[PDB]
Design a protein around this ligand. Structure first.
Ligand code: HEC
Length: 104
């Protein structure tokens, strides 16, 4: 994926609810630092839904690609309000950005 393009997608569609940086604040949604290789619902100090806590998958390219296409289909009852990103290339660019930003 294209990290520069992924950043712009993130700013447009995600940043109002999420931070990525180490020590970044929770906002409407959890800070995403450290997501890759972590099970759902594991950002410390955030009130997740039981739906998000209970999904039980491990975040990575494959599961993000699916989630981000249609978040509520993947995690019904999530409190994340975001309809999804249809395009595969856009999702891959976004995920590439997250893989960098959430591990710096
Ligand atoms: C607010 C209006 C949000 C927008 C826009 C996006 N997200 Fe979100 N996200 C939000 C909340 C409130 C939550 C918690 C949901 C719950 O049911 O408890 C989330 C959760 C996620 C997660 C899961 C985190 C985890 O399991 O630790 C991810 C991976 C995620 N959000 C990513 C994400 C991306 C990449 C976004 C733009 C495409 C995006 N979210 C938008 C709130 C909001």
């Amino acid at each position: 994926g294209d990290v520069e393009k992924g950043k712009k997608i993130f700013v447009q569609k995600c940043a109002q609810c999420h931070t990525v940086e180490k020590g970044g604040k929770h906002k409407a949604g959890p800070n995403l630092h450290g997501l890759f290789g972590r099970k759902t619902g594991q950002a410390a100090g955030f009130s997740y839904t039981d739906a998000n806590k209970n999904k039980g998958i491990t975040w990575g390219e494959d599961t993000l690609m699916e989630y981000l296409e249609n978040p509520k289909k993947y995690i019904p009852g999530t409190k994340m309000i975001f309809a999804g990103i249809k395009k595969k290339g856009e999702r891959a660019d976004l995920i590439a950005y997250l893989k960098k930003a959430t591990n710096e």
